[PDB]
Subunit: 241 residues, 2 copies
């Protein structure tokens, strides 16, 4: 509608977050991004949380529908009613529209305009994530092209993070976590997934002592997710010390 | 594109499983507009869909109102609270429209008749929660009138343990307390409802028992909160 002030959009995104109105939150943040200014660390998290919640609800719904559709097609003497697939396809189109919106914001404003490496890695990781979400629902020749786009974004983010960030950096840790999930679940490379998660965990472990107590908590929380994934993917009980 | 009555009902059940309540409501609104009566299962689908949609709006409106009250600088809170309120009002008006245009009829079974009139009381009550001035008074009168008509039918045609009858009495007592500022009517209604249902609990099948006692617990919880209030084993 009429031109809003960037500061009013950010304030409304924070109000929408408190009200658990994630679609409104995303729309406020999209408007703020389109103002052309860089996002602060707090503002990047608002953009990320808004779209993560929106796409997370779509991905959860798509998974339920896809399971119902699969079971009714496989089982019994008949196929599922056409309604399941039509509804699953409505949810999928809507999911694709949100990923395309995020990828559009990243390519039009956020990746090119970023100052620091911290924010460049954050946006390139986000690009990998939203191509990964698109890959989860893709099937044909489109699937291969989307998987290449996700790998390419994650790899560029990895290259930068290795050059500019310490191994304990939470953004660097979170990126390596998501990239390993991509290798395992999307690119069907469990070996790459395990070696990336092992290397990430080990290199971060070696510098844990150098961290301030608040940095330590941020880092170990992500290292835990790497370790959990490794246990799940890949052995004696532990007594004290 | 399968959008006939039976396809709309099937998609509403899928939307429920996927926790897509706005899709669920839109499917059920479409099914209602087909002009046919809703079965017991279908009425529950309509109710669950709009309850979840309006519940998210009411929770959001309460947060924004809370922030606005503490803040009273900054015009954004009120503008945003007003956007959420208008949207909430639009959903209540859609539900009230469906009830008046298609669902509320003089000739059906008592359960369905009480069910729709209770839903009318509920959505006027949600409108009353955000209403101010002249409009508030008319909305409160409309809610009381719908709830009262639902109460007359339920006392004449349903047993005291009937879950619809229990749920109606619960919501009407909440209306007396919160909306009409009559805590005495609220308390008296909740006490009578609980006591009369308690007397017949022994007659119920195990599935009926669970449905009835679960609503009776909400009446009792409300009574404890409204009136005031140790015990060892026995």
């Amino acid at each position: 509608g009429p031109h809003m002030e960037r500061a009013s959009l950010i304030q409304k995104a924070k109000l929408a977050e408190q009200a658990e109105r994630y679609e409104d939150m995303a729309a406020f943040m999209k408007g703020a991004v389109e103002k052309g200014e860089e996002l602060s660390c707090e503002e990047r998290n608002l953009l990320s949380v808004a779209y993560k919640n929106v796409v997370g609800g779509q991905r959860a719904a798509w998974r339920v529908l896809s399971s119902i559709e699969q079971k009714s097609n496989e089982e019994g003497s008949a196929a599922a009613g056409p309604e399941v697939r039509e509804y699953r396809e409505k949810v999928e189109t809507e999911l694709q529209g949100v990923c395309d919106t995020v990828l559009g914001l990243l390519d039009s404003h956020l990746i090119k305009e970023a100052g620091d490496a911290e924010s460049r890695v954050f946006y390139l990781k986000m690009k990998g994530d939203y191509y990964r979400y698109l890959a989860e629902v893709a099937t044909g020749d489109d699937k291969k092209r989307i998987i290449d786009s996700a790998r390419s974004a994650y790899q560029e983010a990895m290259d930068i993070s290795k050059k500019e960030m310490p191994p304990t950096n939470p953004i660097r840790l979170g990126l390596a976590l998501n990239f390993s999930v991509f290798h395992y679940e999307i690119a069907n490379s469990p070996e790459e997934a395990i070696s990336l998660a092992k290397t990430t965990f080990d290199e971060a472990m070696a510098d844990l002592h150098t961290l301030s107590e608040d940095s330590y908590k941020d880092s170990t929380l992500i290292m835990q997710l790497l370790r959990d994934n490794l246990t799940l993917w890949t052995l004696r009980r532990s007594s004290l010390l």
